[PDB]
């Protein structure tokens, strides 16, 4: 169901180390791929010990980017990525939507992760 067909991968891998026989990721990661035919760019970040946070969504889906909320939520579930953190003061101007709790709102609700549209 959700996320069916999503394909992509990290173009910028997070930094990593092995702690207690487990890999731990930290720093900035950039994932790029396709969802429903559209290009999607997702950035995550965390310090060592904090779960990765969704800090940027960029897509070429201009006509209905809200249709990406379900596959982004599923991608994030698979990855352990959270969407509670507010990046509104740390983001470049030009966001067209904001994602928080994996739901999308328009520019009058600037809280959470910015959603940029590029084509
Ligand atoms: C680079 N990776 C890989 N990875 C986790 O490992 C899964 C498989 O990643 P992969 O890109 O297929 O393999 P890869 O890490 O390149 O393996 P290898 O380099 O040993 O060949 C990913 O779906 C994800 O769960 C990651 N998870 C987080 N949070 N951040 C990251 O940068 C990365």
Author numbering: 1704 to 1822
From the publication, what sentences describe this entry?
The L protein is a multifunctional enzyme catalyzing genome replication as well as viral transcription. As demonstrated for the influenza virus polymerase complex, the bunyavirus L protein is assumed to bind to cap structures of cellular mRNAs, while an endonuclease cleaves the mRNA some nucleotides downstream of the cap creating a short RNA fragment. This capped RNA fragment is subsequently used to prime viral transcription. Here we present the structure of a small globular domain located in the C-terminal region of RVFV L protein along with the first evidence for a functional cap-binding site within the bunyavirus L protein.
RVFV CBD crystallized as a dimer, which is not fully symmetric, with a buried surface area of ~430 Å2 between the monomers. In solution, the protein appears to be monomeric, as revealed by size-exclusion chromatography (S4 Fig, buffer composition: 50 mM Na-phosphate, pH 6.5, 150 mM NaCl, 10% (w/v) glycerol). The structure of RVFV CBD consists of a β-sheet formed by seven β-strands, an additional β-hairpin as well as a long α-helix. Thus, m7GTP was present in all crystallization setups and additional electron density corresponding to an m7GTP ligand was indeed clearly visible in both chains of the RVFV CBD structure. The m7GTP molecule was bound in a small, mainly hydrophobic pocket between two aromatic amino acid side chains, F1713 and Y1728. The phosphate moiety of the cap structure interacts with R1716 side chain, which is extending from the loop between the first β-strand and the β-hairpin. Further contacts with the m7GTP involve M1782, interacting with the guanine moiety and ribose of the cap-structure, as well as Q1717, interacting with the guanine moiety. Isothermal titration calorimetry (ITC) measurements revealed a KD of ~737 μM of RVFV CBD for m7GTP, which is considerably higher than the KD of 1.5 μM reported for m7GTP binding to influenza virus PB2. In summary, changes of the chemical properties of side chains directly interacting with m7GTP in the RVFV CBD structure mostly result in selective transcription defects in the context of the full-length L protein. The binding site topology of the RVFV L protein cap-binding domain, however, is different from the PB2 cap-binding site: The corresponding essential aromatic residue from the end of the long α-helix (α1) in PB2 (F404) is absent in the RVFV structure.
